[PDB]
Amino acid sequence: MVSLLRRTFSEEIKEELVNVPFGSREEVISELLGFIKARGDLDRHIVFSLHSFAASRRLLNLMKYLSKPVSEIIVEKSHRYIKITAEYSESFMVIEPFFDVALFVSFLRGLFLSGGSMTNPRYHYHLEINLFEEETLALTRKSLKDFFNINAGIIELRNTRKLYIKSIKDILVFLEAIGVQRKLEE
């Protein structure tokens, strides 16, 4: 049998995010684009390959709210990730959440759930988000600096790309913006 329980710091944070209430339709669609850009694969449908059980639960709620049929939810044994396959509508692909702080925030939330991780900050200050497309990467950094004064970097390693945050004051600002409350762990 295959376990869905990871006890990492990253999950503890992501479990707290599963519950944040949804917002406008457009805020929901921007988060979904987060998931799509961090972990989506078009070929309908979109197939989402998630490492986070919590992100995975959030995705299914995103799809419920949007009335989007989920085709399949398979857990791949280590003996992990979770493959969710989902219908979509093309208007989802083309929302631009970079110029409205609420849509951007919603979009950061999707990036981080689906492709983000963070080291336990007692040991080391490090938050990254898997995000491959350079246009999207550059727009997100601009909007982070712009709205939040957050200096985001780029990790480039072996045909992968991560958006990167080093500063704990920055990680804090970011985690508060996407909805984390129990970061009173400070």
| Contact footprint for Na ion (CB under 5 A) | 126
Tokens 């925030």 belong to residue: 105
Instruction: Give dist(CA 116, CA 160) in Å, integer.
Output: 14
Could you tell me the CA-to-CA distances from 59 to 97, 134, 163 in Å, in that order?
18, 24, 21
Least Å distance between CB 153 and Na ion? 12
Task: Collapse the DSSP code of 123 into the 3-class scheme (helix H, G, I; strand E, B; otherwise coil) and give the result.
Answer: coil
Nearer to Na ion, 21 or 123 (CB): 123
Q: Which is nearer to Na ion, 80 or 126 (CB)?
A: 126
Residue nearest to Na ion (CB): 126
Q: Least distance (Å) from Na ion to the CB of residue 32?
A: 29
Tell me how far, at minimum, the Cβ of 169 lies from Na ion, in Å. 17
Q: Nearest approach, Cβ of 83 to Na ion (angstroms)?
A: 28
By beta-carbon proximity to Na ion, the closer residue of 33 and 165 is 165
> Smallest distance from the beta carbon of 53 to Na ion, in angstroms?
23
Q: Which among 62, 23, 28, 48 has a CA at the least distance from the CA of 114?
A: 48
- The secondary element (H helix, E strand) that includes residue 50 is strand 46-50
Cβ closest to Na ion, residue 79 vs residue 122: 122
Q: Name every residue whose Cβ is closer than 8 Å to that of residue 91 and which is 6 or more positions away in sequence.
A: 29
For residues 16 and 37, give the distance between their C-alpha atoms in angstroms, rounded to a whole number. Answer: 22
Minimum CB distance to Na ion smaller for 57 or for 162: 162
Q: Are 52 and 113 in contact (CB under 8 A)?
A: yes
Cα separation, 100 vs 81, in Å, equals 32
